[PDB]
Amino acid sequence: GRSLELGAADIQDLESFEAGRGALPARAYLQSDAPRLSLNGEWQFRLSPGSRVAPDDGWQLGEALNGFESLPVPSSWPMHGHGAPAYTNVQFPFAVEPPHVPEANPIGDHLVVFEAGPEFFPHALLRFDGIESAGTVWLNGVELGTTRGSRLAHEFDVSGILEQGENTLAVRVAQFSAASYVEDQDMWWLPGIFRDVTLQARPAAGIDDVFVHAGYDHITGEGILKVEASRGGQAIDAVVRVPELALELAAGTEVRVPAVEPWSAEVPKLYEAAVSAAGESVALQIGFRSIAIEDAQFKVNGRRILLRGVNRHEHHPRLGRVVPRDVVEAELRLMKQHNINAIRTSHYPPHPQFLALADQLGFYVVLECDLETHGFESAGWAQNPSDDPQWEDALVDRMRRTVERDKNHASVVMWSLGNQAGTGRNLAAMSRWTKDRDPSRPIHYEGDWSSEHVDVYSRMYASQAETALIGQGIEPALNDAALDARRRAMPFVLCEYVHAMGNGPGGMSEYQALFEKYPRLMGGFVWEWLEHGITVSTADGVDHYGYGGDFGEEVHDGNFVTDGLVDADRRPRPGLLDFKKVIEPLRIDVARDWTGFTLRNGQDFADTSAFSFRYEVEADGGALDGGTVDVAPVAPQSETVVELPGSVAALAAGLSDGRPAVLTVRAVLGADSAWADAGHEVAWGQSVREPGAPVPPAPVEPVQVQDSELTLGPVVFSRATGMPTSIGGVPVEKLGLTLWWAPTDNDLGREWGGADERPLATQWKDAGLNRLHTRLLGISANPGQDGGETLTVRTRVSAADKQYGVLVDYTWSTDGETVGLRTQVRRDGTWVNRGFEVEWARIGLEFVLGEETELVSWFGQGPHQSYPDTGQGARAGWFSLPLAKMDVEYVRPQECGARSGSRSAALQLGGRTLEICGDPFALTVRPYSQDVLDAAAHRPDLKADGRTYLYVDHALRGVGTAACGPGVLEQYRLKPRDADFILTLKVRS
Amino acid sequence: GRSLELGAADIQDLESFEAGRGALPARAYLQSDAPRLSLNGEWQFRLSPGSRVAPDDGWQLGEALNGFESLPVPSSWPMHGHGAPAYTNVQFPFAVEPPHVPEANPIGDHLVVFEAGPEFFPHALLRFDGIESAGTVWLNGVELGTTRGSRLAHEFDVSGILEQGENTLAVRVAQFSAASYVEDQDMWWLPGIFRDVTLQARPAAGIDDVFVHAGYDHITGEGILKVEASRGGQAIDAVVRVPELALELAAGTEVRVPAVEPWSAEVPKLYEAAVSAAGESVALQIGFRSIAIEDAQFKVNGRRILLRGVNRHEHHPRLGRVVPRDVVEAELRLMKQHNINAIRTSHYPPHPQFLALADQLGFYVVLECDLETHGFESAGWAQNPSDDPQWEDALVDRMRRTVERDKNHASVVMWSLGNQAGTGRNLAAMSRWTKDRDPSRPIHYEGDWSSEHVDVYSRMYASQAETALIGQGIEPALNDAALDARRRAMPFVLCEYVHAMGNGPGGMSEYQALFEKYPRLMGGFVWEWLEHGITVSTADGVDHYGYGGDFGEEVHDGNFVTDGLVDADRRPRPGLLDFKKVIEPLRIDVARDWTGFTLRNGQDFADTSAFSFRYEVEADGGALDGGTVDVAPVAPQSETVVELPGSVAALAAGLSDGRPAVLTVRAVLGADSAWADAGHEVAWGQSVREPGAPVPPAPVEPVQVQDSELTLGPVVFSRATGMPTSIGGVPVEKLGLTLWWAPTDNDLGREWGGADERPLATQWKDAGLNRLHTRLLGISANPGQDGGETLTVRTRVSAADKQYGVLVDYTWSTDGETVGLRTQVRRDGTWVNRGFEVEWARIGLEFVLGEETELVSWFGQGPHQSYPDTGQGARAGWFSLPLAKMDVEYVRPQECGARSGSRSAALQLGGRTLEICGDPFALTVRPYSQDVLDAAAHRPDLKADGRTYLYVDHALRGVGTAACGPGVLEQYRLKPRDADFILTLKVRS
Ligand SMILES: OC[C@H]1O[C@@H](O)[C@H](O)[C@@H](O)[C@H]1O
Ligand SMILES: OC[C@H]1O[C@](O)(CO)[C@@H](O)[C@@H]1O
Ligand SMILES: OC[C@H]1O[C@](O)(CO)[C@@H](O)[C@@H]1O
Ligand SMILES: OC[C@H]1O[C@](O)(CO)[C@@H](O)[C@@H]1O
Ligand SMILES: OC[C@H]1O[C@](O)(CO)[C@@H](O)[C@@H]1O
Ligand code: NA
Ligand code: NA
Ligand code: NA
Ligand code: NA
């Protein structure tokens, strides 16, 4: 007997190493006057759980369809109730045995009917800009071919198949195929026809492909122009016209434009052009720019540039991989509004419409091929497609389609072979093909650290320390002298750094100082631009983002998909506010005497003519003075000192010697730009006259003693515990020391190095920092002033089963009006647990009040959160926010919302108002406890309990980027130590 | 100013290093004719959360009590709604800063009123047999004293305080005190007055203490008798009478009884005696026995003994530390019924009534002092009370009270200083005091491996391998030559071994063989006798046991308190059934020809006269022959061969050469004993004629092919998957390979050694063994016989993200009646993950049937579960049980219920009956899946889903004792390997 299994034919095709069959030559995405009909819209769709059960019932004819239902196209079909999204980071969701596919393989059959007028005859084609991951296509029942390369475009000739009038298009899509083994990016698995489908006419004497070459000679200022045009792979006679430059030339000839204005991310000058043959005309946007590497520097138009980058995935919280155009435009505007100038298309080519937007708004684009075999690493890279000769044609095809589609856009300054694909022969073949095809753009690929087949040295998450050694050209040498000589002559780029997951990222300033200091350093791209949160609702109607595991995944990686500077709806996270400041292209150093400010132009090409420089002096009441000062344009990388009007300094000299006041100088847009309105803030700097130290109240009030209570002015103490039970009428339910916070995503990551690789969160739990207990040692009153007394309460704080502890003494004093509180902390015993030193999250106090807080106001850093190694974007001033807005809406709740650098605070408990002053402290106010915060997996898990949780911290730990990359830097760590700090409290009813 | 805190006086007393004040001389627990009044019953009780808030409102007078309510005494008050139980193993539930106590310290005020008649005047006392942990006692308002030593007795003189008529007793009990630091046993923390309270009259010319000395001369057979009696610490004139021995002697004089019958656990001969003065008489039970160590052997009455022991805690699932007397008697009977002969009072003296029961029923008792400082280990033993001079008086007091109370009982053969208390000067002081006081009993203590201050070498959980080296006297030497010479001359005891947590314990047989082989080995005590489950109910009324964490504990150790041979209600676990067989005191080896059996008397003193030897031959239908055979008494440690009646062997010779049959020889009690009825089984042995190999059915039926289904006789296959969808009408929902089981408690423990210390359960999860997936490679029919065909289904099984897999081929054959299934397993790729070899739990098949199973029957080992390194108690025969009874009711659900050694099985699905035959396999049937079993934390989490989960295993892993002690032994491990095995199936409707 012979075979009896079902569907072996479909599965054999899915297991194919080949690049897909039947498609036209890969070419550029071109704006053409040829008639076109978009087939996007409502299609019919049927889902089958595997190939062996996918019906073979002639559905491709579209007649008598059973089981089909409406579905929009383009779409990621798990976003519409057909199956569910599934998130994995590295691990494959199927057994690793290439090229084989699992039995559980969603098969989607798509069908649409459309009308083809006489414009699409004799010749036309069908274009698919993306199918995840394996498509088969029929038109009127005849097979056109298949598609491989989920984020790449495929075109099929329908001449003689397309019929006048009604036509029926059928597409079978398999989620998984052999191609899934090379599409293992860290993101959601989402099958579907997720990009545009277009019917295009191909008139005779038309234009199939165009290759624009627009160089710039920064010495002469000339533009070097050659525009290739071809039909069916052969060069053709066509006319290229550039009206603005008074140019008419034949395609295929190189000319020298006497003077062009060069293209850059800062000044994205574009010239409108058209290349036309008898039967077709293509409209182009030409940006003249040349890219070169010399003296170990990445240079554009003769100047080293600094990349202020992000890694941009394509994701939408409700449509999956389908990003509507208005979302693309909005988010690119938002990037510019935060001083971003570079984008890495992690880790695949974007929607083809993205390229023209990058050209127009101004971004340096690393365009990356759709290739990642990350899941093979855990097996020592055994069977890695990148080094398997059977995969060469498939991988070269991926690179070719990547290069051909976008080769005409000035914004693309580097080609990238892929991401986390190891090293191998097929990667070298992709580089060789690209170098031969387009030598005008350097090659990028991080996976091969030897850098044998690339033109820049790229790394991800290298420490600040190692980056400094690379910046100096003193990194350790490669074992191969020839390769080392090559790599040392390359400029260095961080294709991913300062992982922006949750609270953070920390340590951005230390990287940036190196970027500004060492020319070899090209800059870096933050990981990543957006969180891939998927919107989920409840019968309550409450909306929250879901992540890995929230969709039934047998195998997932949790919330590592929510690791962005903005949430899935492009709401900024605090890290973006800080990032904007870190990469600001102008440096403003306000003089302490308020006479002027130093201004350095950090841009690479533009001067300062685009900015209006404005100043304001704000005080306790409000603004005292302000205006605008004229600055002679400052050349790029140049420096000057700007005088402020004499009234500003005189105003500084006239203050009371205790009055706080802030002078802020800002650089805003003088006029509307393509990405923001006039007045938009780009850079800023401050100088502060800080408020004098607060006066401790004279201890003139005595301590009144009762059986179970002590009273000292407005404070009533529980005589049993020694802690206050109310201050001026507001109930105090608990007061104690804090040393711990609800772990951030970073605290949950392993900090490599040392024999201790427990995450900091685990070190804390093992140490008991989350379950502190306090023992009362004694209560004592002492002589103060004029019959007054101070009340000292001695305690020891520790945790169950631990011998180490801390002695805490609270000294209370009052004049009847304000309350003086002095806290003294002293280590008792060695703070070591499980053989390693315990580290602290904080040294602070937790006040639990028995009433809710409606409003929180403070003088310090704001408006958003700030921790020791973050908060660059938090400026000095007076701020006020409702309680809900003090919080930060991370998908997985975690420590957040602390306002470091606070000098004074005011909580409003309805009619009463609680004020806190003292030496600089961090402020946090929450309607729920830390234990509720730590336990919560999603924001709906957080509930108010009618209380106010007030945190006053004398010291804080940094947050770092330990979820992926460096942990907290040394200077921001918090090791157990003795400490003392003073506060003052007061209630206004 | 000076102090203002509350309750400093009470707290100062709780923090005291002293042994408690005001009590009478520690003495023996004596049965006296002096009038006594038990004050047990309903008391009044008030709970306060700490000393600083415990009222000082004169409640001791019992007048005008506010906040008091009824509570029984004795009691563990968290067992009655006042607070809650809390379980920790090693870790202290409070900060470790001796002698200080936490602010959260439940304070229980107890009060009772009683009448004192003229019998209690002039002199009387109050006796407290246990208070956890610190008691203060007032009678009619006057303080008698305090108590320390929670499981020790205290007596207070009330002469001149006790008043004629009504009296008021008030007791304040603090849960925590300085004493808690030395009472860190692995058990529930349970405050309360948990043992009897008694008013005793002390007539003039009475007897306060008695010290019985009853030695035995095994050469002459003489008894060496001296009975000390004293009053107020001075020897007194008193008469000792022993009627059975015709003895009248003065107390304080040693005499030589010409002939006594010696006492042993096997023959606990006791002589009734009375010692009397003018005003009081004490009734004693005297067992003549002498204990000695010679030639590195622990000897009683001149013979080396073998300890068949358990560690006995005192626990009740609803009363806490209060064990009712009828429960004590029942559980001690149950121990004897399972061949146990020794008890360790882990880790404190038991209720005083326990000692007379041990004397009467016959146990070798290690009586252990109330001392354990385990929680100091994690800090390098810093501050350990065992070596702190300030604790010497407190610890000597503990030992003194321990020794004095029970010194008169023959069952106590060793004194133990404590448990897991490290090493230190105070332990040496406790040993020195004990040696001087009672030299007739050797000293035990495991904590000091050098054994400097003990008379036996004790260890816990030493591997079988190290035990064998110790048995041979070739263990590694101590650095001190003098101490090494001493320890090598000591016999060796395992005070705890084969940890009996969950499924297990495994490896009991390997220890036992060493015990029988090496005289130096004294035996061992299983950890532990009982699970400390606490009963919990729901509104449903369903009862289940709770463990650590189920009572709100901030700090707990989960289900490690449920680690016993019986559950809290004394229901046997399978481990006890196996243990009974492992330690059976007779060895019965049935001859293969059924002519007779070898019989070895494993006892140390008794012959075989107490046993009736019975035989039976059981066959498929039922019993064929049986009767009783007369055995001449066999001396201890002697051997003989017993002939069986000729009809037995002739019956063996006459069987069909394929018929299964079992000959069982049993040793039962010939007459009622004190611990069981006549006919109770003590030892057994078997000889089996196994059934012939099953015949594979002739493959005469062909394979019928259809579009979506294949049929081969009674099996219908899904043509898409290749798996059967029904066999003879019973629906099959899934069929696949298994390599994993729901981790046992042992699988969750770390196996120390090797660079891999992940628990086996974690190794499995990391390896994906719990989430296997199967890919279909092909289906093929082949020529069988006379037009019949066999159907082969080739598959590959792996898991997501893994490259290793296994190829599984199912060959199906049928003659129309029975179904022949051959399974072939072959490794594909190296089964390595996270750098270490993957191990398998099993090689088997899981059948998921679409109907429920009411009954499971099989021929194999039973009735209870058996795994490769367990099941010693499972004997060969035919068994049948309802589905619920196939399961094992472990508190935390886990893998259990497998019946290894099965030759045939019959599941009844209502009207239809599914039969499985084949070479030996393991059988398991469950109404729920493995994923539900693994997820379940308590038995209510298990739910039936209307299906039958049938597991047929060709190979199984052992279970070991890795939760604490050795993991699975080498010969029971299951490393990935190729395998093949045949089965036959058949349905009877
Ligand atoms: O090496 C550490 C291990 O040592 C063994 O002897 C014993 O099972 C335990 O103490 C365990 O912790
Ligand atoms: O550049 C054009 C290239 O693209 C392909 O057509 C893929 O369809 C190849 O056949 C050709 O080489
Ligand atoms: O014609 C523009 C470009 O496209 C090709 O024709 C092939 O697609 C190339 O030969 C040319 O460089
Ligand atoms: O053996 C009697 C011993 O017991 C104690 O009374 C404890 O109350 C000690 O005072 C005495 O030494
Ligand atoms: O009297 C019996 C035993 O008890 C004591 O009197 C003290 O309690 C000891 O002197 C004696 O050995
Ligand atoms: Na996050
Ligand atoms: Na991620
Ligand atoms: Na258990
Ligand atoms: Na235990």
CSV table of C-alpha atoms in Angstrom, one decimal, chain A residues 135-289:
chain,number,residue,atom,x,y,z
A,135,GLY,CA,0.0,33.2,-0.1
A,136,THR,CA,-1.4,31.4,-3.1
A,137,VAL,CA,-3.3,33.5,-5.6
A,138,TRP,CA,-5.9,32.6,-8.2
A,139,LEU,CA,-7.6,34.9,-10.6
A,140,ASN,CA,-10.8,33.5,-12.2
A,141,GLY,CA,-9.7,30.0,-11.1
A,142,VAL,CA,-6.2,30.0,-12.6
A,143,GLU,CA,-3.2,30.1,-10.3
A,144,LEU,CA,-1.0,33.2,-10.7
A,145,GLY,CA,1.7,32.1,-8.2
A,146,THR,CA,2.8,32.3,-4.5
A,147,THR,CA,4.4,34.8,-2.2
A,148,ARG,CA,7.2,34.6,0.3
A,149,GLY,CA,8.5,37.4,2.3
A,150,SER,CA,5.7,38.6,4.5
A,151,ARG,CA,6.5,42.3,4.5
A,152,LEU,CA,7.7,42.5,0.9
A,153,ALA,CA,5.7,43.3,-2.3
A,154,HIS,CA,4.8,40.8,-5.0
A,155,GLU,CA,3.3,41.5,-8.5
A,156,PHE,CA,1.6,39.1,-10.8
A,157,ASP,CA,0.8,39.5,-14.5
A,158,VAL,CA,-2.9,39.0,-15.3
A,159,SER,CA,-2.7,39.6,-19.1
A,160,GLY,CA,-4.9,37.1,-20.8
A,161,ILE,CA,-6.3,36.0,-17.4
A,162,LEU,CA,-8.0,39.2,-16.4
A,163,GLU,CA,-11.3,39.3,-18.3
A,164,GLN,CA,-13.4,42.3,-19.3
A,165,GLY,CA,-16.0,43.1,-16.6
A,166,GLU,CA,-16.4,40.9,-13.6
A,167,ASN,CA,-13.4,39.0,-12.1
A,168,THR,CA,-12.9,36.8,-9.1
A,169,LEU,CA,-9.7,36.9,-7.0
A,170,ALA,CA,-9.0,34.1,-4.5
A,171,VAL,CA,-6.1,34.0,-2.1
A,172,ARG,CA,-5.2,31.2,0.3
A,173,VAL,CA,-3.0,32.4,3.2
A,174,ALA,CA,-1.2,30.0,5.6
A,175,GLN,CA,-0.1,31.6,8.8
A,176,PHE,CA,3.0,29.4,9.2
A,177,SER,CA,5.4,28.2,6.5
A,178,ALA,CA,9.1,27.5,6.0
A,179,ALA,CA,9.3,31.3,5.9
A,180,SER,CA,8.3,31.6,9.5
A,181,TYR,CA,11.7,30.2,10.4
A,182,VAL,CA,13.2,33.5,9.0
A,183,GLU,CA,10.6,35.8,10.4
A,184,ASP,CA,11.1,35.3,14.2
A,185,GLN,CA,11.0,39.0,15.1
A,186,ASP,CA,10.1,40.0,18.7
A,187,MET,CA,6.4,40.9,18.1
A,188,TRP,CA,3.0,39.5,17.6
A,189,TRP,CA,2.4,36.6,15.2
A,190,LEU,CA,-0.4,37.9,12.9
A,191,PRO,CA,-1.4,36.2,9.7
A,192,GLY,CA,-3.3,38.0,7.0
A,193,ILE,CA,-3.3,40.0,3.8
A,194,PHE,CA,-2.3,43.1,5.8
A,195,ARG,CA,-1.3,45.6,3.1
A,196,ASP,CA,-2.8,47.0,0.0
A,197,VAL,CA,-4.0,45.0,-3.0
A,198,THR,CA,-4.0,46.9,-6.3
A,199,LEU,CA,-4.9,46.2,-9.9
A,200,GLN,CA,-2.6,48.2,-12.1
A,201,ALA,CA,-2.7,48.7,-15.9
A,202,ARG,CA,0.6,48.3,-17.8
A,203,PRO,CA,0.2,50.4,-21.0
A,204,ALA,CA,2.6,49.8,-23.9
A,205,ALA,CA,5.6,52.1,-24.1
A,206,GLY,CA,5.4,52.5,-20.3
A,207,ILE,CA,7.9,52.5,-17.5
A,208,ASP,CA,8.4,49.4,-15.2
A,209,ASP,CA,11.3,50.5,-13.0
A,210,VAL,CA,13.2,53.7,-12.1
A,211,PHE,CA,16.5,54.1,-10.2
A,212,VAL,CA,17.2,57.7,-9.1
A,213,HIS,CA,20.9,58.7,-8.4
A,214,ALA,CA,21.0,62.1,-6.8
A,215,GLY,CA,24.5,62.9,-5.4
A,216,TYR,CA,25.7,66.1,-3.8
A,217,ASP,CA,29.2,67.8,-4.1
A,218,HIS,CA,29.6,69.7,-0.9
A,219,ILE,CA,32.7,71.5,-2.2
A,220,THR,CA,31.2,72.9,-5.4
A,221,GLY,CA,27.5,72.7,-4.3
A,222,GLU,CA,26.7,70.8,-7.5
A,223,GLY,CA,24.1,68.1,-7.8
A,224,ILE,CA,25.0,64.8,-9.6
A,225,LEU,CA,21.9,63.5,-11.3
A,226,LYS,CA,21.2,60.3,-13.2
A,227,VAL,CA,17.8,58.7,-13.5
A,228,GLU,CA,17.6,55.2,-14.9
A,229,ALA,CA,14.3,54.0,-16.5
A,230,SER,CA,13.6,50.6,-18.0
A,231,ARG,CA,10.8,48.5,-19.5
A,232,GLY,CA,10.8,44.7,-19.1
A,233,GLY,CA,14.3,44.9,-17.6
A,234,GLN,CA,15.8,46.9,-20.5
A,235,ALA,CA,16.7,50.6,-20.5
A,236,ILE,CA,14.3,52.7,-22.5
A,237,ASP,CA,14.2,56.2,-24.0
A,238,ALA,CA,12.5,58.5,-21.5
A,239,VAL,CA,12.6,62.2,-20.6
A,240,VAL,CA,13.4,63.4,-17.1
A,241,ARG,CA,12.2,66.9,-16.3
A,242,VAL,CA,12.9,68.9,-13.1
A,243,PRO,CA,11.1,72.2,-13.4
A,244,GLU,CA,12.5,73.9,-10.3
A,245,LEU,CA,16.1,73.3,-11.6
A,246,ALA,CA,15.4,74.2,-15.3
A,247,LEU,CA,16.4,70.7,-16.3
A,248,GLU,CA,15.5,68.5,-19.2
A,249,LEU,CA,17.6,65.4,-19.8
A,250,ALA,CA,17.3,61.9,-21.1
A,251,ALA,CA,17.0,59.0,-18.7
A,252,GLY,CA,20.3,57.0,-18.4
A,253,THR,CA,22.6,60.0,-18.7
A,254,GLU,CA,24.5,61.6,-15.8
A,255,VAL,CA,24.6,65.4,-15.5
A,256,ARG,CA,26.0,68.0,-13.1
A,257,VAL,CA,23.5,70.5,-11.8
A,258,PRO,CA,25.5,73.7,-11.1
A,259,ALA,CA,23.9,74.3,-7.7
A,260,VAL,CA,21.4,72.3,-5.7
A,261,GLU,CA,20.2,72.6,-2.1
A,262,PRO,CA,21.2,69.4,-0.4
A,263,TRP,CA,18.8,67.0,1.4
A,264,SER,CA,19.1,66.2,5.1
A,265,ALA,CA,16.9,65.2,8.0
A,266,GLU,CA,17.2,68.8,9.2
A,267,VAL,CA,16.5,70.4,5.8
A,268,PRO,CA,14.8,67.8,3.7
A,269,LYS,CA,14.9,69.7,0.4
A,270,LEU,CA,13.0,67.8,-2.3
A,271,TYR,CA,12.8,68.6,-6.0
A,272,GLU,CA,9.7,67.5,-7.9
A,273,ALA,CA,10.5,65.5,-11.0
A,274,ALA,CA,8.9,63.4,-13.7
A,275,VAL,CA,10.3,60.7,-15.9
A,276,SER,CA,8.0,59.8,-18.8
A,277,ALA,CA,7.7,57.6,-21.9
A,278,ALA,CA,5.0,57.6,-24.5
A,279,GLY,CA,2.5,55.5,-22.5
A,280,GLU,CA,3.3,56.2,-18.9
A,281,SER,CA,4.8,58.9,-16.6
A,282,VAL,CA,6.3,58.5,-13.1
A,283,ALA,CA,6.4,61.3,-10.5
A,284,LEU,CA,9.4,61.4,-8.3
A,285,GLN,CA,10.7,63.4,-5.3
A,286,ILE,CA,14.5,63.9,-5.6
A,287,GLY,CA,16.7,64.7,-2.6
A,288,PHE,CA,20.3,65.4,-3.5
A,289,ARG,CA,22.5,63.8,-0.8
